[PDB]
Structures are given as C-alpha cells and as structure tokens.
C-alpha cells in the first residue's frame, strides 16, 4: 500500500487532504527523529477489433457486400444470399412448405433461418406477397415489396431484413424516411436463396449479432389466422 501510494502520487497530490496528511507524516517523522492518445499522464488509449469469423462453426454470420447483396453464412460451406432487387425470379403464388417438409431434402439450418426470418416479420397479412421454390432441397423465397407506409408488407419485411443483416443493411435502407420506425426502399422484391460459401463481406464485417437478436423476435408480432393455433 505504501509503495502503491508512492507510485500513484500525482493523481492524489491535488487533494488538500492528501497534502495535509503528507505534511503531518513528515512532521511526525522529523519530531520523532529529533528526540498515441494519453490520459491522466499514465493511461494510453488502445483499441481491439474482434474476429467474428472464428465463430463460424457454431453460429450464423451475416454481412453485406453492397447495397443490394447481403449474406448469412452457416459454417464454411453454405449460406443464404439476400438480394434487394427489382428483378423477380418467381412469377407464381405458391409456397409449398408442406411438401418441402415431407420431402426433407433441404439444409435444416437454412430452413431454420428462413423460419426465424418469416416468423419475425411484424403484422404479415398478405400471403400472396410471399412466393417460394423448394424443389430438390433448394431454398428460394421471394417477398413482393410492391405497394401510409407503416401498415404494409414492404415495411414489415424490410424491418426484419434490417435486423437480419444488421450492419451494412442501412445503405439499402432509410431512403424514404417514414413515420415512426417505418422503412421504405425503391426496391420491388427481397429474394433469399441458398448459396455456397465465399468471402462476400466487402462492406461490413461478418457478425452473428443480427440473427441472435432476431431469435427473440420470433412470433412476437404475428397475427392470428384461425381460432385454434
């Protein structure tokens, strides 16, 4: 404690109590013998950056390539490409989820991510806005964003997308400043398809945060469509 006090003197010298105590100790001793960024001088501001890629084996990692292309990678082999686009690739109204489950050919982790995304959308109420293709075990899901902006399919989908690819997703978004938290883009479709692994993260670092945060959103804001769930 004495040595610690000796090495921490400059920060305590300013206190008048500390000066008084030092003077008293010195007087008692004498009478007895007679008979690059710096802070507070000693603290250097340093930084670290986390390598989220190391988590790839146990949790999904989202990142953004550019305004239109975003990815959620699962492991080192597979993932989902999420593209905001004006070019639709499905021109029918089916989403044959039941048959896809019965055939059981798809990646189970990817189907889990799709389920989490869809269940997280607030107030989804136009089933015709969602089209899908799961033939052969593939995953292809197309959300129609075409049209107050708050009570629209486009807004709910975009809110979920903003969370799912949080970090880098904003550059596609905030283009039409809506009421409250409501989002609007010029894009007509959001497309989600399975892809192979590739280093796509030019715009934002890979990150599990959006997905992990979205887990608690599942079912919070769905509507009832029947009396017995």
């Amino acid at each position, epitope marked *: 404690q004495i040595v610690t006090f000796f090495q921490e003197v400059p920060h305590v010298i300013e206190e008048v109590m500390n000066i008084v105590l030092i003077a008293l100790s010195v007087l008692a001793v004498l009478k007895g013998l007679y008979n690059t960024s710096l802070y507070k001088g000693v603290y250097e501001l340093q930084t670290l950056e986390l390598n989220m890629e190391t988590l790839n084996m146990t949790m999904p990692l989202s990142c953004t390539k550019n*305004n*239109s*292309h975003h990815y959620i990678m699962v492991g080192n082999e597979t993932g989902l490409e999420l*593209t*905001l*686009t*004006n*070019t*639709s*690739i*499905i*021109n*029918h109204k089916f989403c044959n989820l039941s048959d896809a489950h019965k055939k059981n050919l798809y990646d189970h982790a990817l189907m889990s991510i799709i389920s989490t995304f869809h269940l997280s959308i607030p107030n989804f109420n136009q089933y015709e806005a969602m089209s899908c*293709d799961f033939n052969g075990g593939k995953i*292809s899901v197309q959300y129609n964003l075409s049209h107050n902006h708050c009570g629209t399919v486009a807004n709910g989908v975009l809110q979920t997308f903003m969370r799912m690819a949080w970090g880098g997703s904003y550059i596609a978004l905030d283009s039409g400043r809506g009421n409250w938290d409501c989002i609007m883009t*010029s894009y*007509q*479709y959001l497309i989600i398809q399975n892809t192979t692994w590739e280093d796509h993260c030019q715009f934002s670092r890979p990150s599990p945060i959006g997905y992990l945060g979205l887990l608690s959103q599942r079912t919070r804001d769905i509507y009832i469509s029947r009396r017995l769930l």
Partner: antibody
Amino acid sequence: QVQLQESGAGLLKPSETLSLSCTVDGESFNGFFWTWIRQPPGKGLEWIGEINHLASTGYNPSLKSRVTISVDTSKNQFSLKLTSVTAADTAVYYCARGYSYGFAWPNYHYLDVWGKGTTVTVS
Amino acid sequence: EIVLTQSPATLSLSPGERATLSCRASQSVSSYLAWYQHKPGQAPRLLIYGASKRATGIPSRFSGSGSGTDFSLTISSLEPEDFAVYYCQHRSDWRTTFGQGTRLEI
C-alpha cells in the same frame, strides 16, 4: 463463347402444334430469362415469352391461351409449344438469352445471345 | 403495360452522315431501353443496353441516351454496313415489349 442450337419442324398444317426446342451451349443456365421471340413477315419483332431455371414464366397475353414454355435443366434446354396454329403463326422464330439487371438504377435488360432462327410456315 | 413507338418510321440518310433514332415510351420506363440491329436473313444483334452502354464488339460509333419516357440511339458517322432495321426494347417484370422498328436506308 455461347451458342443457342435450335431444333424443331417448321412445316405444319393449320391447327397442329408447333414444337420448337433450343439447347444452350456455354455459360450458366441460371440467372437468365430464356426467351422466345418471333417475327412474322411484314411485321417487327414480337415477344412470345420467357422462362427461368425455376420454370417461372411470362407470356404475351395475345398468345397466353395457346403458348406453353418449359425447361429441362438436365440438358440445358428450353422449349416452346404453340397450339392451334393458323396463318398468323407464319414467322421466323428465335430463341434468345435475356439478362435482367435490377440491382441498381438504371435497371436494364437485354437479349445478348440469339439463335439462328427457324422458318415456321403453316398452310 | 408499357409500349414503345419509334420515330421516324423510315429514315433516309447518306453514308457518313449522323443518324438519330427516337423511342417514346407510353410511361416512365421500368428499365432503360435496349437497341437491336436486325438485318434480313440473320438474327437481331444487340447494340445498346441501359440506354447508354455498348454491347460486346459494338463500335464506338453507336451511342445511346435517354431517360424517363424519351430515348435516343445515335450513329455518329454511319458506314454502309449500318443500313438495317433498329428496334428499341423494354422490359417490366415478366413482360417484354419491342418497338415497331425504324428502317435506315440510303
């Protein structure tokens, strides 16, 4: 280097079924709109329709009731089936590869690779 | 449905002269137009896409311009192998449309 090799009989009697096919040799089958166009003599280019590798389709409404388009991704081919041919279906028929860019403004679309074409006369 | 009208119907110009071809949409376009050259006996050939970009192998003589409803194709100093029919072309989602076409003649 991409080629679109076209096949199918162009000689038909009225009310028969025109059945043309086009095989793609080069580059991917995914990410394109495989398109059928026709040019009847004395007229300009007319879009018959198009299809993806997901077998999603779009058709000209003036022919929608009679046109079917299909894909076979195993052999990288796509097919046009037109029914109840009348003299109005005499034309040169083209298969073409379309590409649509909708990721940023300005969006664009084109038909860059075309087949040779088939003369389809009915009488 | 977005439709296209090409002007003029026929265009008579001397070799080495500048040629301007117009395409008028009926609405503000869903995508920037494409321009094809078509010669009798052969398939149409893609000249311009996105209203301003030259396709592969297209000489720098061909240029394009336009926005909204008005689009133009320009040939600066046309060569004798340029006299053909020219089509503008638009696509909305799952709907492709052409113009009637302009015949460029000597």
